[PDB]
From Swiss-Prot:
The lineage of its organism: Eukaryota, Metazoa, Chordata, Craniata, Vertebrata. It catalyses: hydrogencarbonate + H(+) = CO2 + H2O; urea = cyanamide + H2O. The modification Phosphoserine is found at S161, S168. The gene is CA2. Changing Y3H: Reduced proton transfer rate. Changing T195H: Higher affinity for bicarbonate. Enhanced proton transfer capacity. The keyword Zinc applies. Keywords: Acetylation, Cell membrane, Cytoplasm, Disease variant, Lyase, Membrane, Metal-binding, Osteopetrosis, Phosphoprotein, Zinc. This is Carbonic anhydrase 2. It is linked to Osteopetrosis, autosomal recessive 3: A rare genetic disease characterized by abnormally dense bone, due to defective resorption of immature bone. Osteopetrosis occurs in two forms: a severe autosomal recessive form occurring in utero, infancy, or childhood, and a benign autosomal dominant form occurring in adolescence or adulthood. Recessive osteopetrosis commonly manifests in early infancy with macrocephaly, feeding difficulties, evolving blindness and deafness, bone marrow failure, severe anemia, and hepatosplenomegaly. GO terms for molecular function: arylesterase activity; carbonate dehydratase activity; cyanamide hydratase activity; zinc ion binding. Changing E102 to A/Q: Strongly reduced CO(2) hydrase activity.
């Protein structure tokens, strides 16, 4: 699987039949249809004790990994029940500023999308969580092009070192708190992983308020390669999946 013409999103259902399931992601958020739900609790992000370890190019994106052997970087509150631990974060981006996000707001597409992945500690490890309907919590944050994001610069400078598939780099003392918007107002719905195996185990929480990155910041993303070192160069762009049918599900808002 990939994002090309022959192994792209439209073809995933062949090896991953859950591709046309009832709770696939991403989706389009109809802000006029979302239900204001007064019983949602504010989100609780505890990231001050976060420990980053490395960044790697997995051939379809780049992941920043965190030590999740203890409750160091956790998510709770909101629509969640129990504690979710930060295991890793990645992005989806486009070839142009006009596309890149997975989730769309009134059909509007953003330059990129940041996904903060967390797993339910009641399940003991990430592999068990992905077997549960309440196994993960993904924190989705939109990126728009304007002013630079001071806090994202550290990531951008290290991409040179993981240009190709399989590369990884030590990436310590990276504080995720630098990638958060001022507001924590959100939309939430039941969904899935947006990349194979596309397991229907996620509780999506999409921030209303986007973060702005500079054009040169995002330009650096477009320079990564899908391919392994020594292979024809395939630039790592448009690694996002098209919006799926909502099918009955309801999108709720905390505002
Ligand atoms: Zn993702």
């Amino acid at each position: 699987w990939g994002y090309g013409k022959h192994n792209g999103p439209e073809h995933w259902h062949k090896d991953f039949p859950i591709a046309k399931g009832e709770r696939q992601s991403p989706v389009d958020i109809d802000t006029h249809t979302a239900k204001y739900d007064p019983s949602l609790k504010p989100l609780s992000v505890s990231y001050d004790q976060a420990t980053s370890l490395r960044i790697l190019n997995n051939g379809h994106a780049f992941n920043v990994e965190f030590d999740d052997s203890q409750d160091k970087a956790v998510l709770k509150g909101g629509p969640l029940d129990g504690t979710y631990r930060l295991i890793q974060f990645h992005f989806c981006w486009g070839s142009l500023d006009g596309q890149g996000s997975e989730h769309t707001v009134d059909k509007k597409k953003y330059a990129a999308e940041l996904h903060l992945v967390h797993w339910n500690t009641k399940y003991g490890d990430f592999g068990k969580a992905v077997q549960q309907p309440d196994g993960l919590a993904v924190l989705g944050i939109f990126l728009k092009v304007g002013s630079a994001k001071p806090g994202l610069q550290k990531v951008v400078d290290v991409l040179d070192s993981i240009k190709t598939k399989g590369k990884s780099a030590d990436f310590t003392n990276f504080d995720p708190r630098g990638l958060l918007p001022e507001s924590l107002d959100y939309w939430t719905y039941p969904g899935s992983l947006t990349t194979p195996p596309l397991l229907e185990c996620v509780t999506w929480i999409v921030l209303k308020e986007p973060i702005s990155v500079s054009s040169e910041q995002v330009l650096k993303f477009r320079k990564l390669n899908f391919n392994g070192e020594g292979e024809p160069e395939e630039l790592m762009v448009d690694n996002w999946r098209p919006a799926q049918p909502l099918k009955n599900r309801q999108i709720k808002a905390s505002f």
